[PDB]
Amino acid sequence: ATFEIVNRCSYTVWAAASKGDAALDAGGRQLNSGESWTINVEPGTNGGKIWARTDCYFDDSGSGICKTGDCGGLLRCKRFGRPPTTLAEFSLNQYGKDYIDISNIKGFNVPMNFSPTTRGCRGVRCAADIVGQCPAKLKAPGGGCNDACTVFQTSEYCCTTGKCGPTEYSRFFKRLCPDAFSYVLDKPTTVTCPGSSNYRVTFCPTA
């Protein structure tokens, strides 16, 4: 499957793509404002994610740091990134269909749109100014808006036992972005797409 990753933000981002225990394609790349990077994701990838990283430095070997979304200091991510990270999430070719969503369960850093480029389903978007409106207690000094699990580490926010409800913090994310997951047991906003669809992830879609 092809994923065209497009940075419409006015600032550089370092895109990242991983399924948690391995990179997808090269795993990451710099995207200046306006640039597009198309990756190939293997059919059947389950639990893949794409995100943006901000305020990064990398040396000639590809090792460094990012203020949001850092994946063990690598340009080419092999693992998931450090919150806060807006997440484009996907599982492909699961019994004939693909499944996509956007999630704020690990916080928000950069607005995004995640849409098919082929026929048969809708896209999803979380493009409100979550960082600007973030509750004071969730603001990440390094940048972005943390989720409550990251900040407070309680069973209620982290849904540790598989039982939890919405919270004042989850409702903030859900108010700003109804079409993204706001906590683990949120009413699902996952879209079913034809199996083997192709996609575009756009950072800062309204920019």
36: containing domain: 1-207
| 199-203 and 124-126 strand pairing | unpaired
Domain count, the chain: 1
Distance CA 176, CA 166 (A): 15
Q: 49, 19 in Cβ contact below 8 A? A: yes
Hey, how many other C-beta atoms are within 10 angstroms of the C-beta on 118? Answer: 14
Closest CA to 88 of 6, 2, 17: 17
- Where residue 173 falls (left for φ over 0; alpha for ψ -120 to 50; beta otherwise) is alpha
Tokens of 56: 């990064």
Task: Provide the phi-psi class of 73: left if phi over 0, else alpha when psi is between -120 and 50, else beta.
Answer: left
Task: Give every CB contact of residue 187 below 8 A, 6+ residues apart in sequence.
Answer: none
Q: Which resolution, in Å, applies to this structure? A: 1.1
Cα 48 from chain centroid (whole Å): 10
Nearest alpha-carbon partner for 79 in 25, 130, 19, 128: 19
CATH number at residue 64: 2.60.110.10
Nearest alpha-carbon partner for 5 in 51, 62, 45, 56: 51
**From CA 9, how far away is CA 205, in angstroms rounded?**
8
Method: X-ray
CA separation for the pair 106, 87 (Å, rounded) = 8
What is the CB-side half-sphere exposure of residue 165 using CA atoms within 13 A? 2
User: What residue has token string 């047991």?
Assistant: 185
Q: In angstroms, rounded to a whole number, what is the distance separating the alpha carbons of residues 128 and 130?
A: 6
